[PDB]
Every structure is written in structure tokens, then in C-alpha cells.
Amino acid sequence: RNPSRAGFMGAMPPVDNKRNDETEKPDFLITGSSGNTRDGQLVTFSGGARG
Amino acid sequence: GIALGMIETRGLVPAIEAADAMTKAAEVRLIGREFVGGGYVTVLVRGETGAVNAAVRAGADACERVGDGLVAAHIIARPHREVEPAL
């Protein structure tokens, strides 16, 4: 029909998954992070260093 | 409560945790907290033999896993008359 054009050469834009970094371990629960286990910031030695 | 127990550890995260368990366990009286020096902290407790035993065992096993934990803990059933100079 109406002559379109191709151009581009690279198709879809390179969208990055904002989720990345990781590297270290999330800061001892209580601030974010799902799943997991450990303790409700119990008096247990874990407490802060619950990990 | 002539029967005497005492909880000693390195740093007082376990010391106050154990003392909390002490008072938490029975009608025991915390008579003194002492800074040994070099990081050791001691907490004294007075009461009868059974109550002191329950308190000391509860606190010791509770505090063995917190931070750096207990160092040692035992009980005196019939403390000598020198306890008053000792406190």
C-alpha cells in the first residue's frame, strides 16, 4: 500500500532490567527483601546480625 | 535469697540479655553488675537454689548464641559469710 520505510538497523530499543547490582547481601532483613527465614529481630544472638 | 548465681561474658549484650532472663525466670534479685575490664561483664543474682538454677540455666543457654556469648556460669548453694565483703 503506502510505501513504508525500514531504517533503524537495531530493531527494538535496548531496555535494561532496572533490577541488578546484587553483589552484596541485603541489609539484615527488616528493611525489604521477601522469602527468607531467620528471626523477627529476636533477642537471639542473630538479632541484628540475623543475616 | 542466700543462694547466689552469676553470669559472666565478654561484652554486655549477652550480659544484659542473661540478666533479663535472670529476672525473667523467677523472683530473683539482681544485686550487682560489674565491669571486669578487658571486656568481661559480670551480673550477680540472689535467690533460692531452684529459682536461681532455673534462671541461670535459662539465661546461659539464651545468651550462648547472642553476639559473642557467655564465658562461664555456675552457682553457689551455700555462700560463705564473706559474701557481704564480696559485694
Swiss-Prot record, chain A:
Compositional bias annotation for Basic and acidic residues: 16-27
Family, as annotated: Belongs to the CsoS2 family.
Protein name per UniProt: Carboxysome assembly protein CsoS2
Subunit-level organization: Probably interacts with the carboxysome major shell protein CsoS1 via the N-terminal domain. A CsoS1-CsoS1D-CsoS2 complex can be isolated following expression in E.coli. Interacts via its N-terminal repeats with RuBisCO.
Species whose genome carries this gene: Prochlorococcus marinus subsp. pastoris (strain CCMP1986 / NIES-2087 / MED4)
Top-level taxon: Bacteria
Post-translational modification: Unlike H.neapolitanus and predictions for P.marinus strain MIT 9313, this protein is not thought to have ribosomal frameshifting.
Main function: Required for alpha-carboxysome (Cb) assembly, mediates interaction between RuBisCO and the Cb shell. The protein is probably highly flexible. The C-terminal repeats act as the encapsulation signal to target proteins to the Cb; they are necessary and sufficient to target both CsoS2 and foreign proteins to the Cb. The N-terminal repeats of this protein bind simultaneously to both subunits of RuBisCO. Probably also interacts with the major shell proteins (CsoS1); that interaction would increase the local concentration of CsoS2 so that it can condense RuBisCO and full carboxysomes can be formed.
Classification lineage: Bacteria, Bacillati, Cyanobacteriota, Cyanophyceae, Synechococcales
Localisation per UniProt entry: Carboxysome
Domain notes: Has 3 domains; the N-terminal domain has 4 short repeats, the central region has 6 longer repeats. The C-terminal domain has 2 repeats and a highly conserved C-terminal peptide. The C-repeats serve as the encapsulation signal for the alpha-carboxysome, and are able to target foreign proteins to this organelle.
Stretches for region C-terminal peptide: 21-51
From Swiss-Prot, chain B:
Keyword check for Acyltransferase: no
Compartments where found: Carboxysome
Transmembrane segments: none
One GO MF term: structural constituent of carboxysome shell
Domain comment as written in the entry: The tight homohexamer forms a small pore which is positively charged.
Function comment: The major shell protein of the carboxysome, a polyhedral inclusion where RuBisCO (ribulose bisphosphate carboxylase, ccbL-ccbS) is sequestered. Assembles into hexamers which make sheets that form the facets of the polyhedral carboxysome. There are estimated to be 538 CsoS1 hexamers per carboxysome; note this number includes the probable carboxysome shell vertex proteins CsoS4A and CsoS4B.
Protein name: Major carboxysome shell protein CsoS1
Taxonomic lineage from the root: Bacteria, Bacillati, Cyanobacteriota, Cyanophyceae, Synechococcales
Gene name per UniProt: csoS1
